[PDB]
């Protein structure tokens, strides 16, 4: 199985699950659940919510 990583929460996708959101330009995003998709469509940035992995990266040097 090929391993694809969630765009928002930075988590591996379990095979047989997950989603794929394709954008009008052509950019593709991987969503591991409905929480990540909902926060994505709402407008949150992964950098700002600190339960995501990127938010942890900015908060380590905080």
């Amino acid at each position: 199985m090929e391993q694809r990583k969630c765009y928002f929460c930075g988590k591996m996708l379990e095979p047989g699950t997950g989603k794929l959101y394709v954008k009008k330009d052509g950019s593709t995003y991987f969503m591991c659940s409905s929480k990540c998709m909902s926060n994505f469509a709402l407008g949150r940035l992964p950098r700002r919510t600190e339960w995501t992995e990127k938010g942890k990266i900015q908060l380590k040097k905080a």
């Binding site: 047989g16 997950g18 989603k19 394709v22 954008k23 009008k24 052509g26």
Partner: protein, 132 residues
Amino acid sequence: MKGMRSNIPRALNAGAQIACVDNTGAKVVEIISVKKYRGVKNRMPCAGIGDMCVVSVKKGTPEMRKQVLLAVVVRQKQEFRRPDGLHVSFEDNAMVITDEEGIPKGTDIKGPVAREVAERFPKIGTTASIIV
């Protein structure tokens, strides 16, 4: 027609207005009917990815406007699943003006199209640039 590996829900509904994404000269079309669909009582005809359906041009150049034509769906906002387990979705529906066989009248397609129509209709695959 030839079977598809994936499973496509029939999202768009007869009466829907789609934004055609080619350079033939039309912007908006109106799905009238779906080829190869019997139906039952009270059910509106519906169309999904890779379905040839007759439309009507609503916004476009004067010569193309008011013309009944054939077209297929290349994207849809309603999710569908790959053979190996995954769900794919788009932000907007799209369609391309073609012929009965599948040759698109436009020589240029804007935006991505689903790979399953690319396998069913090879011409749409070649005429496209980015496939997701």
